[PDB]
Amino acid sequence: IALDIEKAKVIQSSIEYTTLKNVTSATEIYYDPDPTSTVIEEDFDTVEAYFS
């Protein structure tokens, strides 16, 4: 690992601390009274694909 850069980078990634807040960009709260469907149109396709 000391003479190889890729394995060293793998070890570095495995050591460094990473929280959810680091990768998160924005969080939102929405009102949706239908458990099996949704009001948002952008995500409607993906969630209906999941449920089906």
Binding site: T24, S25, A26, T27, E28, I29, Y31, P33, V39
Partner: protein, 111 residues
């Protein structure tokens, strides 16, 4: 953005009906209740870019301490302009320039 009560000017907190399954903005100081238009109750930006270009005034061309360039205006193609960096002053802030024309007074970049 949050709305205010139309009768006693207090804040309209969101409320949910168990029987009707609707989102309603209701004032806790009275019985007033108005139907909500959007379900976006709350939004938090961990990384934000607001205030970077929001610090702009319409009289910034009268400041004598600002540098003057000859960059081309995208709208009226003037030959004089005034530039400055980002008004946000965090440690992560970029060093990109904002140019202001002396005729239309709009803010535009160089990219």
């Amino acid at each position: 953005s949050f709305r205010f009560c139309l009768e006693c000017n207090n804040m309209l907190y969101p409320k949910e009906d168990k029987e009707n399954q609707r989102l309603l903005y209701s004032c806790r100081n009275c019985d007033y209740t108005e139907l909500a238009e959007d379900p976006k109750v709350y939004r938090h930006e961990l990384i934000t870019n607001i205030g970077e270009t929001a610090g702009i005034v319409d009289d910034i061309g009268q400041d004598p301490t600002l540098p003057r360039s000859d960059k081309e205006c995208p709208e009226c193609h003037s030959r004089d302009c005034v530039f400055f960096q980002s008004q946000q002053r965090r440690k992560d802030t970029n060093m990109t320039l904002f140019y202001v024309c002396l005729n239309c007074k709009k803010t535009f970049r160089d990219e």
